[PDB]
Structure 1
Amino acid sequence: NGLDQQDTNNLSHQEQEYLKEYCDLITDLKSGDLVDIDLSGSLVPPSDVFIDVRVLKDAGEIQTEYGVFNLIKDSQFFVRQSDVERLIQQGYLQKI
């Protein structure tokens, strides 16, 4: 939930709402102050902002901040690091 057992069967109710409210609290930490940084930001030091990435799965166009980007299956794309990270979070990109 912060970087983006999905089933709750392995989990009892009490702890189910526990984890839900814990995620809500995490969002609250993201909410208001400290919004500038990602509370669940990558703990790896940033190597290079611009990197070329091949599209793992074709999913059509996805809007970036300023540049149009179509996720055409297996297409190299050399752009800033924020977008590629967030799409890695969904896994639609690959190979770094």
Structure 2
Amino acid sequence: MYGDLGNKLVLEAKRTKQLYARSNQDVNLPMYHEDIIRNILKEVSNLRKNTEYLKEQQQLGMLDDKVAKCQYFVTLLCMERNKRCLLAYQRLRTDILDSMAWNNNGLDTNNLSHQEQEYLKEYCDLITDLKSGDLVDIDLSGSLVPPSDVFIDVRVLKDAGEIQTEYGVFNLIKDSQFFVRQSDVERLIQQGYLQKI
């Protein structure tokens, strides 16, 4: 029946939402199901051809006020259902992409559809526009854990040599440990070079 592929697609949606929700990290989302989506879009085209065929044969008009009305209603509702299933899948994966944009890129690519790849590019461009115009005094993409401490100890987890900061340097020697202002190192904790807190 015309709705079954929609159920299979949104079961895929439910499983990938759980795959994202259960883990503490941002898990890189799974492959875009082009095959099931092609099957559903083909089903939509079948339903469109059915409506065209019926609306042509309404000029012959077989009990049309009830029978053709009912046939048209059912084949229209099948298309509404399949639109809902497709949009549910795409809106979920869109939400995950937006979450990933804020969590990383505002500071696995094969799995996206090419529309989703260019969508993500545009949404990252939008985020970087927000933290560039007005309100730029706040890095709007920064952390949402409240600042617990102004100075922290941080252990260098990967080597990165001598780099500057606003009035000094760090030499990121492997398994050296700093005691430093948190606001000067947060970028490197997010990039995974520094360990603690």
| TM-score of the two chains, using structure 1 as the length reference | 0.89
Structure 2: gaps spanning 5 or more residues: 1-104
Q: Deviations over 1:58-86 (max 9, x none)?
A: 11112111121100011111111112211
Q: By percentage of residues, which structure has more strand? A: 1
Alignment of 1:25-44 (within 5 A): 25-44=126-145
3-state SS, counterpart of residue 17 of structure 1: helix
3-state SS, counterpart of residue 24 of structure 1: helix
3-state SS, counterpart of residue 42 of structure 1: coil
* Structure 1 position 21, deviation (Å): 0.2
3-state SS, counterpart of residue 61 of structure 1: strand
Structure 1: gaps spanning 5 or more residues: none
Q: Deviations over 1:36-62 (max 9, x none)?
A: 101111100101111111111111112
* Structure 1 position 95, deviation (Å): 2.3
Per the alignment, residue 111 of structure 2 pairs with 10
3-state SS, counterpart of residue 69 of structure 1: strand
Report runs of 4+ in structure 1 exceeding 3 Å deviation: none
* Structure 1 position 18, deviation (Å): 0.7
Percent of residue pairs identical? 100
Which of the pair has the greater relative contact order for Cα pairs under 8 Å at 6+ separation?
Answer: 1
> Between Structure 1 and Structure 2, how many residues are aligned?
93
Alignment of 1:1-96 (within 5 A): 1-3=105-107, 7-96=108-197
Q: Deviations over 1:9-46 (max 9, x none)?
A: 11111111111000000011111111110111110010
Q: Based on CA coordinates, which of the two structures has the bigger radius of gyration?
A: 2
- Does the 8 Å contact 2:156/2:172 carry over to 1? yes
CA RMSD of aligned residues (A): 1.1
| TM-score of the two chains, using structure 2 as the length reference | 0.45
Q: By percentage of residues, which structure has more helix? A: 2
